[PDB]
């Protein structure tokens, strides 16, 4: 797995540990989306919310998905491609989550939705390239989506998905 796939995974584990130790609240105090005018200009906060996870279950699956999809995109398409997908989806989903439900949140699932969308759409319009989303894995990706949609936020997730579909569109549009 590439340097980008790895660094993100390691950081999510590190933050998660910092969260078990000092408690979630303390960590969010520093990494969460600005929750006061006084934090307005602390720029890392527009991205660092994707690094926090609140349950073993979430970071486990988010990282599995990230490891499979992110790794595939970085290897066949390059680190740069994964960095842009992650940056834009993290900002957009973070923004939509923030707008309808407040600054207290976290998770890499917004970015993960960008990846599922991207891998699947490129692999359907530009078969040729090695990046497609396995038939069986489309089924388990759906189950995962379902788990999330029926709370077993959805807006933040569609925004993440929208960034991925948009980018696969643009790409499978070059040639
Ligand atoms: C979707 C994943 C997003 C991850 C984004 C991580 C960005 C971390 C930016 O931190 C910066 O690191 C510098 C290193 O020296 C500090 O000096 C500076 O104060 C701090 O702002």
PDB file of N, CA and C in Angstrom, residues 56-99:
ATOM      1  N   UNK A  56     -14.815   1.281  17.695  1.00  0.00           N
ATOM      2  CA  UNK A  56     -13.965   0.258  17.130  1.00  0.00           C
ATOM      3  C   UNK A  56     -14.536  -0.130  15.759  1.00  0.00           C
ATOM      4  N   UNK A  57     -15.840  -0.370  15.724  1.00  0.00           N
ATOM      5  CA  UNK A  57     -16.532  -0.766  14.508  1.00  0.00           C
ATOM      6  C   UNK A  57     -16.268   0.172  13.317  1.00  0.00           C
ATOM      7  N   UNK A  58     -16.423   1.475  13.528  1.00  0.00           N
ATOM      8  CA  UNK A  58     -16.218   2.456  12.462  1.00  0.00           C
ATOM      9  C   UNK A  58     -14.810   2.571  11.881  1.00  0.00           C
ATOM     10  N   UNK A  59     -13.809   2.713  12.745  1.00  0.00           N
ATOM     11  CA  UNK A  59     -12.441   2.841  12.262  1.00  0.00           C
ATOM     12  C   UNK A  59     -11.984   1.544  11.585  1.00  0.00           C
ATOM     13  N   UNK A  60     -12.535   0.427  12.043  1.00  0.00           N
ATOM     14  CA  UNK A  60     -12.210  -0.880  11.492  1.00  0.00           C
ATOM     15  C   UNK A  60     -12.660  -0.990  10.038  1.00  0.00           C
ATOM     16  N   UNK A  61     -13.938  -0.708   9.802  1.00  0.00           N
ATOM     17  CA  UNK A  61     -14.488  -0.785   8.460  1.00  0.00           C
ATOM     18  C   UNK A  61     -14.031   0.366   7.587  1.00  0.00           C
ATOM     19  N   UNK A  62     -13.973   1.573   8.146  1.00  0.00           N
ATOM     20  CA  UNK A  62     -13.516   2.703   7.351  1.00  0.00           C
ATOM     21  C   UNK A  62     -12.117   2.412   6.809  1.00  0.00           C
ATOM     22  N   UNK A  63     -11.225   1.953   7.677  1.00  0.00           N
ATOM     23  CA  UNK A  63      -9.869   1.650   7.248  1.00  0.00           C
ATOM     24  C   UNK A  63      -9.776   0.453   6.289  1.00  0.00           C
ATOM     25  N   UNK A  64     -10.687  -0.521   6.410  1.00  0.00           N
ATOM     26  CA  UNK A  64     -10.677  -1.668   5.503  1.00  0.00           C
ATOM     27  C   UNK A  64     -11.011  -1.122   4.124  1.00  0.00           C
ATOM     28  N   UNK A  65     -12.086  -0.350   4.048  1.00  0.00           N
ATOM     29  CA  UNK A  65     -12.490   0.247   2.785  1.00  0.00           C
ATOM     30  C   UNK A  65     -11.407   1.160   2.229  1.00  0.00           C
ATOM     31  N   UNK A  66     -10.824   1.989   3.091  1.00  0.00           N
ATOM     32  CA  UNK A  66      -9.769   2.900   2.667  1.00  0.00           C
ATOM     33  C   UNK A  66      -8.563   2.133   2.144  1.00  0.00           C
ATOM     34  N   UNK A  67      -8.229   1.051   2.840  1.00  0.00           N
ATOM     35  CA  UNK A  67      -7.086   0.223   2.489  1.00  0.00           C
ATOM     36  C   UNK A  67      -7.271  -0.463   1.152  1.00  0.00           C
ATOM     37  N   UNK A  68      -8.485  -0.911   0.890  1.00  0.00           N
ATOM     38  CA  UNK A  68      -8.746  -1.591  -0.360  1.00  0.00           C
ATOM     39  C   UNK A  68      -8.869  -0.614  -1.524  1.00  0.00           C
ATOM     40  N   UNK A  69      -9.761   0.357  -1.386  1.00  0.00           N
ATOM     41  CA  UNK A  69      -9.992   1.332  -2.441  1.00  0.00           C
ATOM     42  C   UNK A  69      -8.878   2.360  -2.580  1.00  0.00           C
ATOM     43  N   UNK A  70      -8.500   2.986  -1.468  1.00  0.00           N
ATOM     44  CA  UNK A  70      -7.445   3.979  -1.515  1.00  0.00           C
ATOM     45  C   UNK A  70      -6.152   3.406  -2.070  1.00  0.00           C
ATOM     46  N   UNK A  71      -5.809   2.206  -1.604  1.00  0.00           N
ATOM     47  CA  UNK A  71      -4.595   1.542  -2.043  1.00  0.00           C
ATOM     48  C   UNK A  71      -4.596   1.270  -3.531  1.00  0.00           C
ATOM     49  N   UNK A  72      -5.741   0.830  -4.044  1.00  0.00           N
ATOM     50  CA  UNK A  72      -5.898   0.540  -5.468  1.00  0.00           C
ATOM     51  C   UNK A  72      -5.775   1.812  -6.321  1.00  0.00           C
ATOM     52  N   UNK A  73      -6.398   2.894  -5.875  1.00  0.00           N
ATOM     53  CA  UNK A  73      -6.329   4.153  -6.609  1.00  0.00           C
ATOM     54  C   UNK A  73      -4.896   4.705  -6.648  1.00  0.00           C
ATOM     55  N   UNK A  74      -4.208   4.645  -5.511  1.00  0.00           N
ATOM     56  CA  UNK A  74      -2.851   5.163  -5.408  1.00  0.00           C
ATOM     57  C   UNK A  74      -1.819   4.369  -6.210  1.00  0.00           C
ATOM     58  N   UNK A  75      -2.010   3.057  -6.264  1.00  0.00           N
ATOM     59  CA  UNK A  75      -1.102   2.179  -6.970  1.00  0.00           C
ATOM     60  C   UNK A  75      -1.278   2.279  -8.480  1.00  0.00           C
ATOM     61  N   UNK A  76      -2.520   2.189  -8.948  1.00  0.00           N
ATOM     62  CA  UNK A  76      -2.815   2.265 -10.379  1.00  0.00           C
ATOM     63  C   UNK A  76      -2.912   3.699 -10.928  1.00  0.00           C
ATOM     64  N   UNK A  77      -3.178   4.676 -10.060  1.00  0.00           N
ATOM     65  CA  UNK A  77      -3.322   6.054 -10.538  1.00  0.00           C
ATOM     66  C   UNK A  77      -2.394   7.089  -9.919  1.00  0.00           C
ATOM     67  N   UNK A  78      -1.751   6.741  -8.812  1.00  0.00           N
ATOM     68  CA  UNK A  78      -0.831   7.672  -8.195  1.00  0.00           C
ATOM     69  C   UNK A  78      -1.314   8.323  -6.922  1.00  0.00           C
ATOM     70  N   UNK A  79      -0.347   8.713  -6.104  1.00  0.00           N
ATOM     71  CA  UNK A  79      -0.605   9.353  -4.830  1.00  0.00           C
ATOM     72  C   UNK A  79      -1.394  10.644  -4.990  1.00  0.00           C
ATOM     73  N   UNK A  80      -1.024  11.422  -6.009  1.00  0.00           N
ATOM     74  CA  UNK A  80      -1.679  12.689  -6.276  1.00  0.00           C
ATOM     75  C   UNK A  80      -3.180  12.545  -6.444  1.00  0.00           C
ATOM     76  N   UNK A  81      -3.584  11.490  -7.145  1.00  0.00           N
ATOM     77  CA  UNK A  81      -4.992  11.223  -7.382  1.00  0.00           C
ATOM     78  C   UNK A  81      -5.725  10.953  -6.062  1.00  0.00           C
ATOM     79  N   UNK A  82      -5.087  10.215  -5.161  1.00  0.00           N
ATOM     80  CA  UNK A  82      -5.719   9.895  -3.889  1.00  0.00           C
ATOM     81  C   UNK A  82      -5.779  11.119  -2.981  1.00  0.00           C
ATOM     82  N   UNK A  83      -4.741  11.943  -3.037  1.00  0.00           N
ATOM     83  CA  UNK A  83      -4.701  13.147  -2.227  1.00  0.00           C
ATOM     84  C   UNK A  83      -5.832  14.115  -2.587  1.00  0.00           C
ATOM     85  N   UNK A  84      -6.088  14.315  -3.877  1.00  0.00           N
ATOM     86  CA  UNK A  84      -7.147  15.236  -4.282  1.00  0.00           C
ATOM     87  C   UNK A  84      -8.525  14.696  -3.917  1.00  0.00           C
ATOM     88  N   UNK A  85      -8.747  13.406  -4.156  1.00  0.00           N
ATOM     89  CA  UNK A  85     -10.018  12.784  -3.806  1.00  0.00           C
ATOM     90  C   UNK A  85     -10.305  12.962  -2.299  1.00  0.00           C
ATOM     91  N   UNK A  86      -9.281  12.718  -1.482  1.00  0.00           N
ATOM     92  CA  UNK A  86      -9.376  12.820  -0.029  1.00  0.00           C
ATOM     93  C   UNK A  86      -9.590  14.254   0.450  1.00  0.00           C
ATOM     94  N   UNK A  87      -8.837  15.183  -0.127  1.00  0.00           N
ATOM     95  CA  UNK A  87      -8.953  16.576   0.257  1.00  0.00           C
ATOM     96  C   UNK A  87     -10.331  17.169  -0.040  1.00  0.00           C
ATOM     97  N   UNK A  88     -10.816  16.973  -1.258  1.00  0.00           N
ATOM     98  CA  UNK A  88     -12.104  17.526  -1.658  1.00  0.00           C
ATOM     99  C   UNK A  88     -13.284  16.861  -0.960  1.00  0.00           C
ATOM    100  N   UNK A  89     -13.257  15.530  -0.833  1.00  0.00           N
ATOM    101  CA  UNK A  89     -14.350  14.817  -0.179  1.00  0.00           C
ATOM    102  C   UNK A  89     -14.382  15.093   1.314  1.00  0.00           C
ATOM    103  N   UNK A  90     -13.212  15.281   1.917  1.00  0.00           N
ATOM    104  CA  UNK A  90     -13.149  15.581   3.337  1.00  0.00           C
ATOM    105  C   UNK A  90     -13.746  16.969   3.597  1.00  0.00           C
ATOM    106  N   UNK A  91     -13.429  17.943   2.750  1.00  0.00           N
ATOM    107  CA  UNK A  91     -13.965  19.298   2.908  1.00  0.00           C
ATOM    108  C   UNK A  91     -15.473  19.355   2.680  1.00  0.00           C
ATOM    109  N   UNK A  92     -15.918  18.769   1.571  1.00  0.00           N
ATOM    110  CA  UNK A  92     -17.331  18.803   1.215  1.00  0.00           C
ATOM    111  C   UNK A  92     -18.242  18.069   2.203  1.00  0.00           C
ATOM    112  N   UNK A  93     -17.876  16.844   2.577  1.00  0.00           N
ATOM    113  CA  UNK A  93     -18.704  16.089   3.509  1.00  0.00           C
ATOM    114  C   UNK A  93     -18.645  16.733   4.882  1.00  0.00           C
ATOM    115  N   UNK A  94     -17.473  17.245   5.250  1.00  0.00           N
ATOM    116  CA  UNK A  94     -17.325  17.896   6.538  1.00  0.00           C
ATOM    117  C   UNK A  94     -18.225  19.118   6.625  1.00  0.00           C
ATOM    118  N   UNK A  95     -18.318  19.845   5.514  1.00  0.00           N
ATOM    119  CA  UNK A  95     -19.126  21.052   5.398  1.00  0.00           C
ATOM    120  C   UNK A  95     -20.636  20.781   5.513  1.00  0.00           C
ATOM    121  N   UNK A  96     -21.100  19.760   4.799  1.00  0.00           N
ATOM    122  CA  UNK A  96     -22.506  19.384   4.787  1.00  0.00           C
ATOM    123  C   UNK A  96     -22.936  18.828   6.145  1.00  0.00           C
ATOM    124  N   UNK A  97     -22.039  18.077   6.778  1.00  0.00           N
ATOM    125  CA  UNK A  97     -22.293  17.486   8.084  1.00  0.00           C
ATOM    126  C   UNK A  97     -22.455  18.633   9.058  1.00  0.00           C
ATOM    127  N   UNK A  98     -21.510  19.562   8.966  1.00  0.00           N
ATOM    128  CA  UNK A  98     -21.443  20.750   9.802  1.00  0.00           C
ATOM    129  C   UNK A  98     -22.713  21.618   9.704  1.00  0.00           C
ATOM    130  N   UNK A  99     -23.183  21.835   8.476  1.00  0.00           N
ATOM    131  CA  UNK A  99     -24.349  22.662   8.203  1.00  0.00           C
ATOM    132  C   UNK A  99     -25.665  22.154   8.774  1.00  0.00           C
TER     133      UNK A  99
END
